[PDB]
Motif scaffolding. Structure first.
Motif, PDB file in Angstrom:
ATOM      1  N   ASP A   7      -7.115  -1.491   6.785  1.00 20.58           N
ATOM      2  CA  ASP A   7      -7.817   0.016   5.747  1.00 20.58           C
ATOM      3  C   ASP A   7      -8.708   0.504   5.315  1.00 20.58           C
ATOM      4  OD1 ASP A   7      -4.398  -0.442   5.404  1.00 20.58           O
ATOM      5  OD2 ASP A   7      -4.223  -1.810   3.765  1.00 20.58           O
ATOM      6  N   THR A   8      -9.431  -0.900   5.135  1.00 18.93           N
ATOM      7  CA  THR A   8     -11.234   0.171   4.348  1.00 18.93           C
ATOM      8  C   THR A   8     -11.638   0.584   5.817  1.00 18.93           C
ATOM      9  OG1 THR A   8     -11.077  -2.288   3.405  1.00 18.93           O
ATOM     10  CG2 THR A   8     -13.278  -1.499   4.576  1.00 18.93           C
ATOM     11  N   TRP A  11      -4.573   4.741  -1.674  1.00 16.89           N
ATOM     12  CA  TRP A  11      -6.082   3.604  -2.170  1.00 16.89           C
ATOM     13  C   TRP A  11      -6.369   3.128  -3.475  1.00 16.89           C
ATOM     14  CZ3 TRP A  11     -10.963   3.020  -2.969  1.00 16.89           C
ATOM     15  CH2 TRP A  11     -12.540   2.261  -1.527  1.00 16.89           C
ATOM     16  N   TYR A  64      -9.781   7.229   1.435  1.00 17.11           N
ATOM     17  CA  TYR A  64      -9.938   7.011   0.275  1.00 17.11           C
ATOM     18  C   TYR A  64      -9.941   7.819  -0.904  1.00 17.11           C
ATOM     19  CZ  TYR A  64     -13.363   2.797   2.395  1.00 17.11           C
ATOM     20  OH  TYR A  64     -13.718   2.217   3.045  1.00 17.11           O
ATOM     21  N   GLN A  74     -15.393  -1.910  -3.545  1.00 17.17           N
ATOM     22  CA  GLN A  74     -14.503  -2.193  -3.831  1.00 17.17           C
ATOM     23  C   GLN A  74     -14.106  -3.207  -4.462  1.00 17.17           C
ATOM     24  OE1 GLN A  74     -11.109  -2.171  -0.422  1.00 17.17           O
ATOM     25  NE2 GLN A  74     -13.171  -2.152   0.153  1.00 17.17           N
ATOM     26  N   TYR A  98      -4.133   1.503  -4.449  1.00 18.76           N
ATOM     27  CA  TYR A  98      -3.935   0.358  -4.098  1.00 18.76           C
ATOM     28  C   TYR A  98      -5.134  -0.687  -4.839  1.00 18.76           C
ATOM     29  CZ  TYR A  98      -2.133  -3.675  -1.311  1.00 18.76           C
ATOM     30  OH  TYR A  98      -1.083  -4.997  -0.621  1.00 18.76           O
ATOM     31  N   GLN A  99      -6.709  -0.477  -4.910  1.00 19.03           N
ATOM     32  CA  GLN A  99      -6.899  -1.183  -5.167  1.00 19.03           C
ATOM     33  C   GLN A  99      -7.264  -2.051  -6.383  1.00 19.03           C
ATOM     34  OE1 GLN A  99      -9.433  -0.738  -2.371  1.00 19.03           O
ATOM     35  NE2 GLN A  99     -10.599  -1.996  -3.368  1.00 19.03           N
ATOM     36  N   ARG A 144      -8.056   4.171   6.306  1.00 23.11           N
ATOM     37  CA  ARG A 144      -7.419   4.954   5.358  1.00 23.11           C
ATOM     38  C   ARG A 144      -8.636   5.530   4.621  1.00 23.11           C
ATOM     39  NH1 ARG A 144      -1.726   3.328   5.158  1.00 23.11           N
ATOM     40  NH2 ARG A 144      -1.591   1.333   4.705  1.00 23.11           N
ATOM     41  N   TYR A 150       0.715  -1.346   0.252  1.00 27.27           N
ATOM     42  CA  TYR A 150       0.087  -0.221   0.248  1.00 27.27           C
ATOM     43  C   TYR A 150       0.894   1.081   0.623  1.00 27.27           C
ATOM     44  CZ  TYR A 150      -4.088   2.773   1.125  1.00 27.27           C
ATOM     45  OH  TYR A 150      -5.372   4.137   1.211  1.00 27.27           O
TER      46      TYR A 150
END
Ligand code: HEM
Ligand code: HEM
Ligand SMILES: [Xe]
Ligand SMILES: [Xe]
Lengths: 191, 191
Positions: B95-96, B105, B101, B177, B108-109, B99, B7
Motif C-alpha cells: 500500500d505504501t 488512503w 495517497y 505515516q 486508512y492512516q 496506493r 482499506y
C-alpha cells in the motif's frame, strides 16, 4: 552564556527516567557504537554549525506554514524569536553530540518538548507568536533534520562508511529525542 | 481476502484531509520524485516480503518490552495475534508503495493509528492483549522500520543511488505515516 538555555537548571524533573531511556534506546537500535559515532559527528559538525543553521532556517523560511511558528500575530517573522532560538538550536547540535544521556539530559528533553508545546512555547524568549507547534510537524521534521545533516558529515572527507555510521547515529538520536518530546502532547497514560 | 484489512471500507472519515497532507508532505520533503521511487521500492520488495517480515518480527520478538504488545495477559506471545497482524503489515508494505495517497488512503492512516492506540487495539482480531502501544515507540520505530528495509532494497542489484533514492522515499513515507498515526494519541487541538 546562551539566553534561554537552561540545560542542567530546569525547574522540573522529567516524567521519564533512565530505565525508560534504555528501552527506548533499544527501540531505536541505539548502542555504545552509536555513542562513539554521535561523538564523532560532533567533532565534524562543530566547525560548520553556522552553515548548517542557514541550511535549516532556509528550509524553514521557505515554507510559510513552517515559518508560521516563528511569526508575530501579524504574520511577519519575529526576528528576535528566530535569532534567540537559533543560538539554542546550535547548542543542541553539540549537546546531542557530547552530553551523557543521563537524567540531566532527559530533564532537558522534557523541557525542549514543553517549549514546542503550548505549555511553554514563547515564554523562554518572552515573545508573542503562535501558541503551539502541531505535533505532526515534530515527527515530520525527523526527515529534513537528518537529511540536512548528511552532506555536512561528508565535508571533512571521511570515508563513506564512517559517514554512514555518523548519519545513522544522528538519525537514531533525532528519532529518540522527538519521541521523548511528544510527552506533553500525548494524552496522559498513552505515552 | 486479508482478515481485518479494511482499506477503503473504514467507518470513519479521517480528521485530516488532502490539504493537511500536502503540507505534511512538504514538511517531510516528499515530492513527485518520491512517488516514482516509492513505487519502484514496491516492485523491488514485493518478492522478498516474507523475508522482510521475518527480519522485522525477529527484531520485535527479541525485545520483551516490544514483543509485550503482542502478548496475552499471562505474558506469552499471542500467536493468533502475530499471524493476523503480519498479513496486514505485509499488505501495508505494498500500500505504501502503490496506493494514491488520497482521502481513502488518509482514512486508512487514521484507522491504523486507532488500532495502535487504545481506541481500537485488539478489536480487529478479537484478542485479549495490552490495551495501548505507548506512542513513544511508534516514533522510535521509524528507525528500525527504515533500517530493516535498506538491505532489501539493494538485493535486485540496483545501483546505490537508486537504492539511496528508494530508501529516502521510504524513510519519508514511514515518517509521514507515523506522524498521521499520532492523531488519536495527541491532546485534541495539539495535533
Ligand atoms: C526533529 C524535529 C525538531 C528538532 C530536532 C527541533 C529542534 C529545536 C531546538 C534544539 C530548539 C531549542 C530548544 C531550547 O533549548 O530552548 C527548538 C525550539 C523551537 N523550534 Fe524546534 N525542533 C524540531 C521541530 C520543530 C518544528 C516542526 C518546528 C516548526 C517550525 C519548530 C520550531 C521551533 C520553534 C518556534 C522553537 C522555539 C519554541 C519556544 O518558543 O521556546 N521545531 N527546536
Ligand atoms: C514505524 C512504526 C510502525 C509501523 C510502520 C507499524 C506498522 C503496522 C501495520 C501496517 C499494522 C497493521 C494495521 C492494519 O491494517 O490493521 C500494525 C499493527 C500493529 N502493530 Fe505496528 N507499526 C509501527 C509501530 C509499532 C510498535 C512500536 C509496535 C510495538 C511492538 C507495534 C505493534 C503492533 C501491534 C500490536 C498491531 C496490531 C494492533 C491491533 O490490535 O490492531 N507497531 N502495525
Ligand atoms: Xe539540522
Ligand atoms: Xe519493515
Amino acid at each position: 552564556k546562551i539566553p534561554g538555555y537552561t540545560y542542567g537548571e530546569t525547574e522540573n524533573r522529567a516524567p521519564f527516567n533512565l530505565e525508560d531511556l534504555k528501552l527506548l534506546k533499544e527501540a531505536v537500535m541505539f548502542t555504545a557504537e552509536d555513542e562513539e559515532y554521535i561523538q564523532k559527528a560532533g567533532e565534524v559538525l562543530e566547525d560548520q554549525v553556522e552553515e548548517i543553521l542557514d541550511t535549516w532556517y532556509g528550509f524553514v523560511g521557505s515554507h510559510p506554514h513552517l515559518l508560521y511558528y516563528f511569526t508575530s500575530p501579524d504574520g511577519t517573522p519575529n526576528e528576535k524569536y528566530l535569532a534567540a532560538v537559533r543560538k539554542r538550536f546550535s547548542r543542541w547540535i553539540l549537546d546531542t553530540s557530547n552530553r551523557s544521556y543521563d537524567q540531566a539530559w532527559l530533564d532537558y528533553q522534557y523541557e525542549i518538548g514543553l517549549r514546542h508545546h503550548r505549555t511553554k512555547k514563547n515564554q523562554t524568549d518572552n515573545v508573542e507568536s503562535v501558541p503551539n507547534i502541531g505535533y505532526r510537524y515534530l515527527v515530520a521534521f525527523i526527515y529534513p533534520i537528518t537529511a540536512t545533516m548528511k552532506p555536512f558529515l561528508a565535508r571533512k572527507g571521511h570515508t563513506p562508511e564512517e559517514v554512514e555510521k555518523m548519519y545513522q547515529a544522528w538519525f537514531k538520536a533525532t528519532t529518540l529525542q522527538v519521541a521523548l518530546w511528544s510527552y506533553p502532547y500525548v494524552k496522559y497514560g498513552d505515552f
